[PDB]
Amino acid sequence: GIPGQLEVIKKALDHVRVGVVITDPALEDNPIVYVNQGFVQMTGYETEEILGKNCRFLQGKHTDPAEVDNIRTALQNKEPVTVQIQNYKKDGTMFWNELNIDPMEIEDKTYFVGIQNDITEHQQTQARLQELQSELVHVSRLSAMGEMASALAHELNQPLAAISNYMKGSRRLLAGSSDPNTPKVESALDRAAEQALRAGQIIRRLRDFVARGESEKRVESLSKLIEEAGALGLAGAREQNVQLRFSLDPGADLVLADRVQIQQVLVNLFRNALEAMAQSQRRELVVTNTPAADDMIEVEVSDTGSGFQDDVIPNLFQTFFTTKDTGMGVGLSISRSIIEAHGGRMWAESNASGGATFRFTLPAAD
C-alpha cells in the first residue's frame, strides 16, 4: 500500500550518494525537514545536527557572498537555481558544492528540494589539466632548443664520418711508408680516432635521452643509470672543480624502472646542484644508494651549494615555484610525479654543510 511504498523510496534515497535536502519555507527561516544519508556522508554532520537548520550553516569564510545572493533571490521568486559554491564539512574541510535547487508544488504547498554534489575532485582534475597544458606552453622555447640541439648533433655525424674515412684511408697509405716519422703519424691518427669515437658517444647519449621511445618499466642497474645521467648532466663539473663521489652499494643496485625517466630525474638534480654551487667555496656532490623499507631502494643526492632558506622547503616541488630569475620551476614537480608513478617518494632536506639533499625511492627488483 501507499505506506510501504513510502518506505521503499526513502530507503532508496539513502543509497543515492548525492546529498538531498528538502526545506519547508512555511516554517521560520526555511529549515531542512528531510535529509538523506548522502548529505550526511558528504558533510560529516549527523542527521540531528542538520534537521531543523537552514542550509546556510554549511557556509564559511571563502563562500562567495554574491552567489549566496543569487540563491536568496531565486528562492524569493520561487525560481530554480544552480550554483557552484564553497561549503565546509563538520571537520572544517572545504568542499566545492554544486548546488541545484528547485521549487516543488505538492497539494498547493511549496517546498524546495536541494541536490548537492561534492565536485572538489572534479575541480582538482580540471585544474590539473589546465596546469599540464600550461607547463607544456611554459617549456616550449627550451624544448625547441633541445630539439635543435638534437638535430644539430645528428648533423654532426656526417663530417665525423668523413673524418673517419679520411683517417682510415690515410692509415691504409701509411702502411706502405717506411719513413721514420710514420709510427708517430699513426699514433696521432689513432688518438684522433679515439676523439671521434668519444664525440660520437656524446651525440648518441643526447639523442637516446630525447627520443620519445618505449616507456616500459624494467630491471635496471642504478650504477649504470647514475653514470648515464652523469655523462649528460655533470658536464662542466670537473672544470668547475666539483668533487664527484658515487658511493654505491652493489647489493642494492637493481630497481624496477623506466631508465630514461630515472635518468631525467637525476639529470635535473645534477644541473640544479651545479647551479647551486656556482658561488660556493667547497663544491662536493655525493650520490648514494641504500636499502629502504618495503623492498625499496633509496637514492640520495647531496651538494654543498647555497641550499634552502627556511621558508623554501615546503614549496620546492610546487609547479612553477622557482627562486631563479630565469627559472621555470617545473623540474622538481615533474621529477616527483615520475617517482610517484614508479611507486616511490621524493623529498628534500637541508644538510649539515648548508647545502641541499634530495632523496627518492624506487622498488627493488631481483
**What residues between 332 and 351 interact with ligand ADP by CB under 6 A?**
332-333
Q: If binding is defined by CB under 6 A, does position 45 make contact with ligand FMN?
A: no
Q: If binding is defined by CB under 6 A, does position 36 make contact with ligand FMN?
A: no
**Contacts with ligand FMN in 112-141 (CB under 6 A)?**
112-114, 116
**Contacts with ligand ADP in 170-209 (CB under 6 A)?**
none
Angle between helices 222-233 and 259-276 (to 10 degrees): 50
Calpha distance 294→265 (Å, rounded): 22
Determine phi and psi for 187, rounding to 5 degrees: -60, -50
Q: If binding is defined by CB under 6 A, does position 244 make contact with ligand ADP?
A: no
User: Residues touching ligand ADP: how many (CB under 6 A)?
Assistant: 22
Minimum distance from CB of 77 to ligand FMN (Å)? 13
Query: Choosing among ligand FMN, ligand ADP, its own copies, none, which partner's interface includes residue 294 (Cβ < 5 to 8 Å by kind)?
Result: none
For residues 230 and 329, which CB has a smaller minimum distance to ligand ADP in the complex?
A: 329
For residues 43 and 252, which CB has a smaller minimum distance to its own copies in the complex?
A: 43
Query: Choosing among ligand ADP, its own copies, ligand FMN, none, which partner's interface includes residue 316 (Cβ < 5 to 8 Å by kind)?
Result: ligand ADP
One-letter amino acid of 231: A
**Number of residues in the chain:** 366
Using the rule CB under 6 A, which residue among 43, 117, 272, 361 binds ligand ADP? 272
Q: If binding is defined by CB under 6 A, does position 72 make contact with ligand FMN?
A: yes
One-letter amino acid of 102: D
For residues 67 and 253, which CB has a smaller minimum distance to ligand FMN in the complex?
A: 67
Query: Choosing among its own copies, ligand FMN, ligand ADP, none, which partner's interface includes residue 68 (Cβ < 5 to 8 Å by kind)?
Result: ligand FMN
Q: If binding is defined by CB under 6 A, does position 316 make contact with ligand ADP?
A: yes
Q: If binding is defined by CB under 6 A, does position 276 make contact with ligand ADP?
A: yes
Minimum distance from CB of 128 to ligand ADP (Å)? 17
Can you give the chain as a three-state secondary structure string?
A: CHHHHHHHHHHHHCCCCCEEEEECCCCCCCCEEEECHHHHHHHCCCHHHCCCCCHHHHCCCCCCHHHHHHHHHHHHCCCCEEEEEEEECCCCCEEEEEEEEEEEEECCEEEEEEEEEECHHHHHHHHHHHHHHHHHHHCHHHHHHHHHHHHHHHHHHHHHHHHHHHHHHHHHHHCCCCCCCHHHHHHHHHHHHHHHHHHHHHHHHHHHHHCCCCCCCEEEEHHHHHHHHHHHHCCCCCCCCCEEEEECCHHHCEEEECHHHHHHHHHHHHHHHHHHCCCCCCCEEEEEEEEECCCEEEEEEECCCCCCCCCCHHHCCCCCCCCCCCCCCCHHHHHHHHHHHCCCCEEEEECCCCCEEEEEEEEECC
Q: State the number of CA atoms in the 13 A half-sphere of 263 facing the CB.
A: 22
Query: Choosing among its own copies, ligand FMN, ligand ADP, none, which partner's interface includes residue 292 (Cβ < 5 to 8 Å by kind)?
Result: none
Using the rule CB under 6 A, which residue among 322, 337, 351, 353 binds ligand ADP? 322
> Which residues, 6+ apart, have CB-to-CB distance to 303 below 8 Å?
273, 276, 277, 283, 284, 285, 286, 355, 356, 357
For residues 114 and 344, which CB has a smaller minimum distance to ligand FMN in the complex?
A: 114
Q: If binding is defined by CB under 6 A, does position 237 make contact with ligand FMN?
A: no
Residue nearest to ligand ADP (CB): 331
Minimum distance from CB of 114 to its own copies (Å)? 9
Which range touches ligand FMN (CB under 6 A), out of 3-11, 96-104, 192-200, 356-364? Answer: 96-104
Which range touches ligand FMN (CB under 6 A), out of 93-101, 221-229, 280-288, 317-325? Answer: 93-101
Minimum distance from CB of 347 to its own copies (Å)? 18
- Site residues (vs ligand FMN, CB under 6 A): 21, 23, 30, 54-56, 58-59, 68, 71-72, 75, 85, 87, 97, 99, 101, 112-114, 116
- Site residues (vs ligand ADP, CB under 6 A): 268, 272-273, 276, 303, 305-308, 316, 321-324, 327-333, 356
